Design a binder for this molecule. Structure first.
Ligand code: DGT
Ligand code: CA
Ligand code: CA
Ligand code: CA
Ligand code: CA
Ligand code: CA
Ligand code: CA
Ligand code: CA
Length: 901
DNA sequence: TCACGTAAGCAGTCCGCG
DNA sequence: GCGGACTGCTTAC
């Protein structure tokens, strides 16, 4: 096999590299890498190196990396550009791996670990590490084993050994229900004392040194705690054995509000699963506890125990250890579904970066572009200082708030990357500028044609047409990868709907799920067999189809994220290729494209309907248009359709055969107008929406920009077994909205769109009558909690104190004195409840850490003083009033002449 | 919330609005 | 009471 790196570090004048050799073995080497950098030279001098603008450069080879860094400094002192890759480990990887990397994940040691620390006096601070580490579970991907290190003797209690037999038993047997599939994979090691435990862990770590290190909050808790605890017991040198090169650095992580400290282990790539989840999952959660996320992702029950966690080891050590083991497994289960480790490895090896750099698209793109240019003997420019400047973004149409019965939407494929490719936008393709007219003039095609030579954006920029820029070239590669995975995702989605259909008529038989590849549309033969399957087999196939869809979604949406982040990176001052001319060229072109096609669609439809000035496009945001299809349906007549599917088919055919060709012609004209390099504005039908045939449902409504709901029957070629609510921006979609309220508002919307006013009124009446029975957590609002200290004036709210911060200050006074009570963490999320006038907390609201039950010291009083009326008005009635008034209907029955008889 | 971008909605504070 | 200036937080794209 071809070799591939695992980790790379610069330490002084050496590169330290862990890699897999040509025989599949893990090796380590120290290399005295001599980097090269570049300077401009006279034209009359013979060279093969040129900068991206075509100016000749001389290569300077340095005795060592420090000499290269000091040369960069002197060049600044002189006032001359120092060209080339200044991150020497990226240059090393580029030199050492000058081919497309084919990696074997089975040779990469991926470690997933979790620790337990008993602490009576509050949260055990990693920087202090003053309490014993009393449990470690460490899963190794190569061994496929859970290594359990269990402390039996502590100043906080002496305990008996954990029993794997009781661990395996049902909770109804007094057991812990550790999943049977991992029982045989547990390697249990009890310890007489903490020093023994930690020494053995370090020996273990040395034998099985993680390459990728993950877990849940490992970077903020587990790693710095273990490091600092070993440091406290044994000294720094022993703690540094956590690094395969015995080098660590305290790293200060700074944000807008403050700073925290992590430990950097040289020679290890830490990918904390919480951070992977936050970047790559496209969720915003009310809580990021492992229990909360595990329930959301896997539908597993909350890990139940009695009393505080600080007393769990002493009261029930058996459960204590089992739950530590289960916590490690939960992360593995989440990754088996979401596949973020696979994604990170794919992206990291593609770009030739340290794997942990996948969090940074700026770093990722710097490496991709550097490697690409190096292939042509081209030389990258020096990164420069830039002041942060605002620049314009997308266009969003102001909709007329209303119900909209029949709606068909259309959307541009991968817009910003398609603009980059169409226009040929890149640092080195800038050809000059032209005199700009108002955007309106380009939109309406009355402005003078910008150029007869170059490819243009309506921000005034011109680009070369003779050759693709490096940015278009490299963005195209990742776009094409994304396209493949999106195809797999959509096929799995369509396949899932087939199974859902068949589930309406399951067979009474014993059988097995079919062995199929869900990434490809089911054949006729598979379809025939599916129709003969039991509900058990069908449900298993559905689960598998949905897992395939999720895997496809991870792969496609995050490649979309990477390419969109290149468009954004052009507007970030730390990007080597930062250029507001280019960032704005993209966004302004987008504004034109959307409003151009709005005009074209309105013109086309006014023509076919024989009208004038009628607004068929009701809304658009960035790259999408929403078209009123009422007049199209009315042209054949609702009574002419056999069922809902019949008019959906009709609108599908109309979009495909009439509208898409009209849209295409309109965009080809725009391409010619801007003289672009390549026509890539591909706008396809997205959603077909409307009420069920024969119903009183309203189909859809808009309340304003970025706030709408549609009853969708078909989305991007997926014909749903049951209609799907597409709700954007409304309170149902916000993590700040109480869980039970999201649910109730969603049902109000469902009834509005599918059933009509009377159904809505019936439901509202019931919710208002019963909502006081709902669990307090389900009706609590949620908010991030920043700058608590800023608004804290002697325990009370200062001027302009936000409502949720007021709640936290209330909480802090009510728990004051208690070291044991859960503390609200700065920057984390809280639940928030309003309190009735005259309550013992002395304020109008209270907040506590999200994902948790409020402490038993104040729970009874919170429940008693909860202001249900205010809660209902703010979270439910106010938003529903917004929905219904927009839709022109009433959530409460109006008085009529029929009342009373 | 260390880690690409802008547009834009709503909650809530403060205070005006005769 | 609403709304404007503002902070804060959260979505859509
Ligand atoms: N910089 C940046 N721009 C974004 C992001 N999300 C959306 N945009 C901009 C660029 C997109 O091309 C454009 C339209 O977004 P869409 O959600 O419709 O996705 P896009 O067209 O890229 O992909 P698609 O092929 O429709 O699935 O909006 C983002 O996360 N970062
Ligand atoms: Ca724990
Ligand atoms: Ca799009
Ligand atoms: Ca599409
Ligand atoms: Ca059947
Ligand atoms: Ca879109
Ligand atoms: Ca098309
Ligand atoms: Ca203070």
């Amino acid at each position: 096999m071809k070799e591939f790196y695992l980790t790379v570090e610069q330490i002084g004048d050496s590169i330290f590299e862990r890699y897999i050799d040509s025989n599949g073995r893990e090796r380590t080497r120290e290399v005295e890498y001599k980097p090269s950098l570049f300077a401009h030279c006279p034209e009359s001098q013979a060279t093969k190196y040129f900068d991206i603008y075509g100016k000749p450069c001389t290569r300077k080879l340095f005795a060592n990396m420090r000499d290269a860094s000091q040369w960069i400094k002197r060049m600044e002192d002189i006032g001359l550009e120092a060209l080339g890759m200044d991150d020497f480990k990226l240059a090393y990887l580029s030199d050492t791996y000058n081919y497309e990397i084919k990696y074997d994940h089975t040779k990469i040691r991926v470690a997933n670990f979790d620790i337990e620390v008993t602490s009576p006096d509050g949260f055990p601070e990693p920087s202090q590490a003053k309490h014993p580490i009393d449990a470690i579970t460490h899963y190794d991907s190569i061994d496929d084993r859970f290594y359990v290190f269990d402390l039996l003797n502590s100043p906080y209690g002496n305990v008996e050994e954990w029993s794997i037999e009781i661990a395996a038993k049902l909770q109804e047997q007094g057991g812990d229900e550790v999943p049977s599939e991992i029982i045989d994979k547990i390697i249990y090691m009890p310890f007489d004392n903490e020093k023994e435990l930690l020494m053995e862990y370090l020996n273990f770590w040395q034998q099985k040194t993680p390459v990728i290190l993950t877990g849940w909050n490992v970077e903020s808790f587990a790693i710095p705690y273990v490091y600092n605890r070993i440091k406290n017991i044994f000294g720094e040198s022993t703690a540094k054995r956590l690094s395969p090169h015995r080098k660590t650095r305290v790293k200060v992580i700074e944000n807008m509000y403050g700073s925290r400290e992590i430990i950097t282990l040289f020679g290890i790539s830490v990918l904390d699963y919480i951070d992977l989840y936050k970047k790559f999952s496209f969720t915003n959660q009310p809580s990021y506890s492992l229990d909360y996320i595990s329930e959301f992702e896997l539908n597993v029950g909350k890990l139940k125990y009695d009393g505080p966690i600080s007393k769990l080891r002493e009261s029930n050590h058996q459960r204590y250890i089992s739950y530590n083991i289960i916590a490690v497994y939960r992360v593995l289960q989440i990754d088996a579904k979401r596949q973020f480790i696979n994604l990170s490895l794919d992206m990291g090896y593609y770009a030739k970066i340290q794997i942990q750099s996948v969090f940074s698209p700026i770093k990722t793109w710097d490496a991709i572009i550097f490697n690409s240019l190096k292939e042509q003997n081209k030389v990258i420019p020096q990164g420069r200082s830039h002041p942060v400047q605002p620049y314009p973004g997308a266009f969003v149409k102001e909709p007329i708030p209303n119900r909209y019965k029949y709606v068909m939407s259309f959307d541009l494929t991968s817009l910003y990357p398609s603009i980059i490719r169409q226009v040929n936008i890149s640092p080195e393709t800038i050809a000059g500028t032209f005199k700009v007219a108002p955007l309106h003039d380009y939109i309406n095609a009355v402005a003078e044609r910008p150029s007869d030579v170059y490819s243009c954006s309506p921000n005034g920029m011109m680009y070369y047409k003779d050759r693709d820029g490096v940015v278009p070239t490299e963005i195209t590669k990742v776009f094409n990868q994304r396209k493949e995975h999106k195809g797999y995702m959509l096929a799995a989605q369509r396949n899932g709907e087939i199974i859902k259909e068949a589930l309406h008529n399951p067979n009474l038989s014993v059988d097995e799920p079919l062995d199929v590849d869900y990434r490809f549309d089911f054949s006729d033969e598979i379809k025939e067999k599916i129709k003969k399957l039991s509900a058990k087999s069908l449900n298993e196939m559905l689960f598998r189809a949905q897992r395939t869809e999720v895997a496809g979604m991870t792969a496609q949406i995050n490649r979309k994220l990477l390419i969109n982040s290149l468009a954004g990176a052009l507007g970030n001052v730390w990007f080597r290729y930062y250029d507001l001319r280019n960032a704005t060229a993209i966004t302004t072109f987008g504004q034109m494209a959307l409003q151009w096609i709005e005009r074209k669609v309105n013109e086309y439809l006014n023509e076919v309907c024989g009208t004038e000035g009628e607004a068929f496009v009701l809304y658009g945001d960035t790259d999408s248009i929403y078209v009123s299809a009422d007049k199209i349906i009315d042209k054949v007549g609702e009574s002419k359709f056999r069922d809902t599917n019949h008019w959906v088919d009709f609108l599908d055919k109309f979009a495909r055969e009439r509208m898409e060709p009209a849209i295409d012609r309109g965009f080809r004209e725009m391409c010619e107008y801007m003289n672009n390099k390549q026509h890539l504005m591909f706008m396809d039908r997205e959603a077909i929406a409307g009420p069920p045939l024969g119903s009183k449902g309203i189909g859809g409504f808009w309340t304003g920009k970025k706030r709408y709901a549609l009853n969708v029957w078909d989305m991007e070629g997926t014909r749903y077994a049951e209609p799907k609510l597409k709700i954007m921006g409304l309170e149902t979609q916000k993590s700040s909205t109480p869980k039970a309220v999201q649910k109730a508002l969603k049902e109000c919307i469902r009834r509005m769109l599918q059933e009509g006013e009377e159904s809505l009124q019936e439901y509202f009446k019931e919710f208002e009558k019963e909502f006081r029975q709902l669990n307090y957590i389900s009706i609590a609002s949620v908010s991030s909690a920043n700058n608590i200290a800023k608004y804290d004036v002697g325990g009370f709210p200062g001027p302009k104190c936000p409502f949720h911060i007021r709640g936290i200050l209330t909480y802090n006074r009510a728990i004051k004195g208690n070291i044991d009570a859960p503390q609200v963490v700065e920057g984390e999320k809280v639940y928030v409840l309003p309190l009735r006038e005259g309550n013992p907390f002395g304020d109008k609201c209270i907040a506590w850490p999200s994902g948790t039950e409020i402490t038993d010291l104040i729970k009874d009083d919170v429940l008693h003083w909860m202001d249900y009326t205010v809660l209902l008005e703010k979270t439910f009635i106010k938003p529903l009033e917004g929905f219904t008034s927009a839709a022109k209907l009433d959530y409460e029955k109006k008085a009529s002449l029929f009342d009373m008889f």
